[PDB]
């Protein structure tokens, strides 16, 4: 009931809206509204056929998938969505020229690994257009979460003609994108603080889309957000720190468990030279010197809780006995000032220095600045002779500097792309596109490269955390909001792109 226009906020400028290249939660959420793959997560968090017209035929050994495509699916320029669009985009994803950070997900597809490494041509990838509306996908091995990959933006189709025509400007703004999802993107210049979703009249399932328009603006402090919410300019707003705590008893307060882990990254090599974090004792000193409980109680105050695992609690469970991965792994790198100070003294002796300066990178929101000041406080008071310089940059700049290894240490986070520990653990394999720390442990790589698979993944976390201190988990993220009661059917996805607005609607007045 009433006008079906939804007004939302986002905490950062869009880093990428290229469905192949995007690897961040902001951009992946955008392309999830505007484009669509073979599957998409349903209301219960299960991948369901979307671009696929029916349930695939699957071989006995579960490696060959024969998939019929919707014959009524169209691009926003009227071109039909065909098998060729999937072949093109999956080859694009593995093509070394593209340097797509998620190219490693295509290890699941026959020859994907070899193509990323330049050992085979992209045309050898295990996807074939049998005809214009039929795919044959050949996996490298049985992959239980394959349908979750099919629901992930890197596996969405692309219109080769359009992508080619736009060249290096492809997806740099909303005029340089094509849409096959519930919404079209409008009003995005590439670098501005507003953008718009408009119901796509050429979407095959448009009769289920109820919102005519979704307006998004960048807001980076809860006070501004709250004022906009109270003056009815936005319908949902993020609350952090005291703003969460002051509104936690409000009728419209809601908490979202993101099953995401925020962690400290320790870059071991910058501009070709070892940093101080090449020393394990120094990594351990920083890691163990942060009161994680106080952090969440002081900085977040939003349902977030301390993390002593990379893999979040409550997310993934043993196929044998159904017990949580985190219970089997146990805690790692628990807050301990004395053990931190022991590591600090030993590290400083090994390096032959009395003092160290390092720069801590985080984002440029009000709460990220509070976070950084808290961590600076913790490390400086606990570790004599340590100076921590603060860098607080736009999310996209942090990510660029991460890819370039142009940082010392940083606050980073990962949300799962499918429901298995590997979504987290695979990040820190040697030379991985999401490693970017020059962290390399061959035993860790060997583990990650069925009950046996699970048991080994449990063991891997001990190597990463307790043994090597590659990173330091800080918290398991929840997010607090005020949310107007008239928003109905707001689908929060348990993994992959964060939201699906497709069937969201409003019961205003």
């Amino acid at each position: 009931s009433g006008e079906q226009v939804l007004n939302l906020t986002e905490s950062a400028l869009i880093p990428s809206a290229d469905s192949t290249k995007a690897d961040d939660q902001v951009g992946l959420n955008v392309v999830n509204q505007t484009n669509e793959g073979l599957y998409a997560l349903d209301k219960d968090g299960i991948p369901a056929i979307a671009g696929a017209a029916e349930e695939p035929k699957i071989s006995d050994d579960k490696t060959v998938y024969t998939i019929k495509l919707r014959e009524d699916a169209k691009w926003s320029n009227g071109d039909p969505v065909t098998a060729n669009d999937y072949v093109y985009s999956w080859r694009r994803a593995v093509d070394p020229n593209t340097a797509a950070t998620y190219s490693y997900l295509f290890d699941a597809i026959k020859n994907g690994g070899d193509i990323v490494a330049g050992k085979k041509k992209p045309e050898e990838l295990g996807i074939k257009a049998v005809d214009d509306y039929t795919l044959e996908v050949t996996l490298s091995k049985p992959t239980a979460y394959i349908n979750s990959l099919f629901a992930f933006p890197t596996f969405f189709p692309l219109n080769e003609k359009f992508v080619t025509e736009k060249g290096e400007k492809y997806a740099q703004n909303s005029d340089n994108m094509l849409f096959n999802g519930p919404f079209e993107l409008k009003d995005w210049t590439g670098t501005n603080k507003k953008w718009t979703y408009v119901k796509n009249d050429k979407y095959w399932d448009k009769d289920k889309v109820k919102l005519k328009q979704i307006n998004v603006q960048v807001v980076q402090d809860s006070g501004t957000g709250l004022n906009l919410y109270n003056t009815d300019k936005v319908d949902r707003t993020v609350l952090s720190a005291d703003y969460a705590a002051q509104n936690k008893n409000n009728k419209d307060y809601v908490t979202v468990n993101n099953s995401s882990t925020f962690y400290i990254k320790f870059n071991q090599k910058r501009a070709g030279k070892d940093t101080v974090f090449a020393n394990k004792n120094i990594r351990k000193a920083i890691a163990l010197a942060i009161d994680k409980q106080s952090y969440t109680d002081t900085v977040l105050k939003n349902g977030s809780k301390p993390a002593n695992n990379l893999v979040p609690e409550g997310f993934t469970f043993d196929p044998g006995n159904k017990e949580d991965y985190t219970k089997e792994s146990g805690k790692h790198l628990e807050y301990d000032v004395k053990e931190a100070q022991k590591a600090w003294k030993a590290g400083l002796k090994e390096l032959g220095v009395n003092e160290i300066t390092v720069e801590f990178t985080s984002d440029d929101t009000e709460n990220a600045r509070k976070s950084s000041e808290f961590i600076q406080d913790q490390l400086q008071k606990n570790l004599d002779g340590l100076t921590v310089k603060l860098k607080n940059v736009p999310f996209k700049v942090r990510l660029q500097n991460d890819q370039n290894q142009d940082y010392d240490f940083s606050m980073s986070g990962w949300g799962p792309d499918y429901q298995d520990p590997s979504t987290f653990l695979d990040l820190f394999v040697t030379d991985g596109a999401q490693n970017r720390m020059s962290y390399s442990n061959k035993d860790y790589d060997k583990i990650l490269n069925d009950q046996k698979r699970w048991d080994e993944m449990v063991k891997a976390e001990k190597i990463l955390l307790t043994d090597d201190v590659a990173i330091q988990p800080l918290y398991q993220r929840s997010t607090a909001y005020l949310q107007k009661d008239y928003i109905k059917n707001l689908q929060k996805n348990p993994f992959g792109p964060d939201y699906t607005y497709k069937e969201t609607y409003l019961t205003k007045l």
Binding site: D24, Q25, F262, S362, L399, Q434
Partner: peptide, 6 residues
Amino acid sequence: SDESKG
């Protein structure tokens, strides 16, 4: 997916 600190 890489997470932003709100």
